[PDB]
Every structure is written in structure tokens, then in C-alpha cells.
Amino acid sequence: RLTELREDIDAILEDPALEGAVSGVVVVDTATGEELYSRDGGEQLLPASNMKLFTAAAALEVLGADHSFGTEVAAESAPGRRGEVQDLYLVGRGDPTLSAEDLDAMAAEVAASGVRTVRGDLYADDTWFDSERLVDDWWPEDEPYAYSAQISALTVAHGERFDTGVTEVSVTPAAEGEPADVDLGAAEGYAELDNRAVTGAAGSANTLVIDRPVGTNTIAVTGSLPADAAPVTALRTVDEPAALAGHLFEEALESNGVTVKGDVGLGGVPADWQDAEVLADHTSAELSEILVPFMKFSNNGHAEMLVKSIGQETAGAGTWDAGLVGVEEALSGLGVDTAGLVLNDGSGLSRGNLVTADTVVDLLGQAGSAPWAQTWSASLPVAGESDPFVGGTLANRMRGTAAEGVVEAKTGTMSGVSALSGYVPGPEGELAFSIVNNGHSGPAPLAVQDAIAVRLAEYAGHQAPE
């Protein structure tokens, strides 16, 4: 058994896919508390998205699994006669789930409260958080994609997965030689557009390219899409999430009989109206719930918003520095020795982050005993599970093995970095394990991971399906 499992893991770690790579692998039994396996457990390594474990085990400590984020609209004073108001501020406070409709339900309320004309400018206020959009060491080349969307307190979230600070761009073919049709999704009318994409012959090489050149708010498209090609869509971030939530809400009011004479812009409530009238409000779901679409798909923008949210709680400052300090200590009050830790962000996107397989495992145990241990274990990706909201980043891994429907682990992928940490619940023992790989030069060593996971699934007393 134990004397056996060792040789197995060792052999799996001898995979050529890991040459030159440093691997942090640690396995412990959450019950007995016995150390089943350990190789370089103390080595500091980049955790990539596995950093989200620390971020989630802290948000639940700081904000409570019942936490809810709210949004609001306000004017100095309510309307009356011709139901006319001056300036209006869209004020949000870190809701990571603001839907387009959520804004439309508020556009309606604004009208349902008598307003019929906004003779003033339409400002968007997101001061609950600082205006520091990206972590200092993130790379600017990664700024056009959903993974690296700017952080703001007031940002619109796309789809059922809540991809924040982004817009869905679409490219539809035409006739060979004619320009292609580009729709900018929500950022239509907001972000600029430079359509250089043509429609290529039917059966031609698709060479489409959707970009947001650094430093601008322009969605650029180049290359060509074949005439016979199927319509393409793609998430893209926008400069200043708030200004877009501002643009959409402006469109939303207009869709609810409220005319806006002034301009739409970035601004905070004057701090001159200590008792402004709150024309409408919105409350999101509880963190316990938002947890799911966070840890299953590793929402990066969610992670950072939580961090800062922790920074507003523990110290009234929507900031990373304050947020991270909160996480560090919250992980300490949770009983986690945070010595080998180095927190530079909440998502794991930063190469300034560092953990040790032991610190990860440590965190796994402690979190299992917290009064929120269930809403936490359930947020984790389940192996081999076909349904996106259950399998998450593990929906296409370990299908048909003892690990199917069993392993609850968190992933982490980055250039030269990959990780898998979680629990393997088996009648033969509750298990917590961490696998961190840094330095390999080829693709993520999934098979190596899966192999160890699936072997643990067995060690825990599971069998592969027939």
C-alpha cells in the first residue's frame, strides 16, 4: 500500500516531459494526518492559478459565505414635475456578476421612480476600489484577452461565467473580396473599431486576428475569414470597465424611456450630496454561490476583485496591498504557516507569486475544517465531469478512471508552470495533494498529473469504470 504507492509516484515523475522542471509534489491523509508522499515540498514555486485556493480560503474568512455585492444609481435630488434630474452616477461596489440585464432592470427602476429626463451628464463611479487596473508585474501583451481584464469596482460581466471587463466581438463572412462584418458586442459605440478583415475564398486559410493594441480602446481586426467559414466570436477586454458599464446603462435608460442629454463619463459622487436620492439598486448572489463560477473556470478578474474586496473590509481600501495583507493574515488566523508564501495577486497571473507544495497542502487541510468547508470543496473542479459547471478545468481529464467524479482539485496553467492541488475522498482515506511544476519546456505535464491523481483515486479505494 503506502510502501507501494511511493514507487508508483516516483516512476510517474520520471517522465521526460519533466526534464529541467522542478516539481513540488506532496500528498497527505486529511484523516490520520499521515504524510503519504513528499518531494521538494518546501521548494518555493510559482503557483499560477493555484493561488486562487489561498484567495478563496481568505474571502470566505473575511467576507463570509453570505457576502453580497450591491450596485446603485443616484442623483443629488429625486425628480418631480417633468420628472427631470441633472447628473446621475452609476455606483457599483465590487459586484463580479453585473449582468447586462441587471443594468436594464435598474434602467427601468430609474424610470419607475419618475425620472424621464437626465438633463445632466451620466457619470460612472467605481471608487469603492482604487483605479489601479492591472497588477504591476502582469504583462501588457496579455492585456487584450479576458484573462487579463482591467480591475474596476464597476464592471459588466459577460455570460453565465461572468467574464468581467470584456466584450464579445463577432466576425461574420461575406462574399469573397468584400469586407467582413464585425460586431463589437457590448463595446459597440464605446470602443473604436478598425476593420481591415476581408472575406477569403471558400475553403481558404482562416487568418483572422482580433486585437486591442496596447494603450488604446480600439478593437482591431486584420487578415481574412473564408466565405464558407462559420461566424467567429471572441472575448476581448476594454479599457476602463466602468466607462463601458456607463455606456451600456446609458443605452439601457434610453431603452426605458429616459432621455440622457449630457455625456457619459468617469466620475464619483460629489461628496457634496451627503444624502443623495438612490433611484435604484441591485444585489447579486452570495459569495457561496459566486464561488462556483469562480473556482471552476478560474476567473482571474474575480480573484482580484475578491482581494480588493477584502481590502475594503479589513481596512476600507479597495487595493491589492491592503487586500493581500488581509489574505496573508486571514490564512494565518486559519492556522496556515505562511512563511514560504509570497502574495503578489489573487488570481495567480503574477510571476511574483510563490508557494510550496506543503503550504498548499497545509491550506487544503485547514480549509476542510472551516465552517465553510462544504461551499469551498464544492466550488472546486471535479475530474472527468462533462458538465462545465461541475468539471470545470477538469471536464476533459481523467474521464473513465478512478478519478472520475471523485478528485476535487484546482488547476494552474502558465508558460512553464502547471499545477494540480486538491482532495481525493476515498473510503480508504480523505486525501489532500499538491503537484506544482515549474521549468518544464514543453506542454503542461497533464498526463503526469492525471497519472498521480488517478493513482491516488485508487489508493483511496476507487475503481475505474467498465
Binding residues for substrate: 410
Name the minimum Å distance from CB 190 to Mg ion: 6
Catalytic residue among 38, 298, 309, 434: 298
Which residues, numbered 270-309, are part of the site for ligand NCF (CB under 6 A)? 298, 300
Q: What is the dihedral of CA 57, 59, 65, 67, to 10 degrees?
A: 180
136 binds ligand NCF (CB under 6 A): no
DSSP class of residue 382 equals B
Should residue 54 be labelled a site residue for ligand NCF when binding is judged by CB under 6 A?
no
- Per the DSSP assignment, residues forming a β-bridge with 218 are 192
Compare residues 224 and 299 and give the one whose CB is closer to ligand NCF: 299
- What CA–CA distance (Å, rounded) separates 375 from 368? 10
- Please calculate the CA angle 380-400-387 and round it to the nearest 5 degrees: 45
Which C-beta is closer to ligand NCF: that of 94 or that of 412? 412
Binding partner of 188, given ligand NCF, Mg ion, none, CB within 5-8 angstroms per partner class: Mg ion
Q: Are 376 and 56 in contact (CB under 8 A)?
A: yes
Dihedral angle of Cα 410, 413, 418, 423, to the nearest 10 degrees = 0
Yes or no: say if 311 and 179 are a contact pair by the CB < 8 Å rule. Answer: no
Could you tell me which residues are annotated as the binding site?
410
Binding residues among 74-133 for ligand NCF as defined by CB under 6 A: none
Query: Rule CB under 6 A: is residue 34 a binding residue for ligand NCF?
Result: no
In angstroms, the Cα distances linking 288 to 135, 373, 406, 424 are 26, 11, 21, 22
Q: How far is the CB of 150 from ligand NCF (least distance, A)?
A: 14
Closer CB to ligand NCF, residue 314 or residue 353?
A: 353
Residue 413 near which of ligand NCF, Mg ion, none (CB within 5-8 Å, type-dependent): ligand NCF
Q: How many residues are recorded in the chain?
A: 466
Can you tell me whether residue 367 is helix, strand or coil?
helix
Residue 233 Cβ vs Mg ion, minimum distance, rounded to whole Å: 17
User: Residue 96 has which C-alpha cell?
Assistant: 463580479
- Of 23, 49, 224, 434, which one is the catalytic site residue? 49
Provide the minimum distance between the beta carbon of 193 and Mg ion in the complex, in angstroms, as a whole number.
12
Q: Which residues bind Mg ion (CB under 5 A)?
A: 188-189, 406, 462
Nearer to Mg ion, 46 or 382 (CB): 382
Considering only residues 354-383, where is the footprint of ligand NCF by CB under 6 A?
none
Closest residue to ligand NCF in the complex (CB): 49
Which of 97, 284, 393, 421 lies at the binding interface for ligand NCF (CB under 6 A)?
393
Give residue number: closest CB to Mg ion: 189
Closest C-alpha to 289, from 69, 72, 105: 69
Q: Nearest approach, Cβ of 236 to ligand NCF (angstroms)?
A: 14
Of 32, 347, 301, 297, whose CA–CA distance to 154 is shortest? Answer: 301
Of 152 and 393, the one with the shorter C-beta distance to ligand NCF is 393
Question: Which partner from the list Mg ion, ligand NCF, none does 49 bind, CB cut-off 5 to 8 Å by kind?
Answer: ligand NCF
Among 49, 55, 237, 312, binds ligand NCF (CB under 6 A): 49
**Sequence-ordered list of residues with C-beta below 8 angstroms from that of 199, at least 6 positions apart, any chain:** 173, 174, 175, 176, 177, 178, 179, 180, 224, 225, 226, 227
Q: Which does 37 bind (CB under 5 to 8 A by kind): Mg ion, ligand NCF, none?
A: none
For residues 293 and 389, the answer to whether their CB atoms sit within 8 Å is yes
Residue closer to Mg ion by CB (options 363, 406) is 406
- Look up residue 381 and give its three cell numbers: 473542479
Cα three-residue angle 311-313-314, rounded to 5 degrees: 70
Look up 332 and say whether it is catalytic. Answer: no
Strand arrangement of the beta sheet that strand 181-183 belongs to: 181-183, 166-172, 232-237
Strand partners, 421: 410, 434
Site for ligand NCF in 400-439 (CB under 6 A): 411-414
Pairing of strands 232-237, 209-211: unpaired
Residues 146-205 that bind ligand NCF (CB under 6 A): 147
Considering beta carbons, is residue 411 or 438 the nearer one to ligand NCF?
411
Q: 377: helix, coil or strand?
A: helix
Query: With binding defined as CB under 6 A, does residue 449 bind ligand NCF?
Result: no
Catalytic residue at 224? no
- Return the number of the residue (298 or 434) whose C-beta is nearest ligand NCF: 298
Q: Is 308 a catalytic residue?
A: no
Among 142, 192, 254, 263, binds ligand NCF (CB under 6 A): 142
CB of 143 vs ligand NCF, minimal distance in Å: 10
Q: Which of 23, 38, 52, 152 is catalytic?
A: 52
For the chain, the first-to-last Cα distance in angstroms comes to: 24
Q: Which residues bind ligand NCF (CB under 6 A)?
A: 48-49, 142, 147, 298, 300, 348-349, 393, 411-414
Catalytic residues: 49, 52, 298
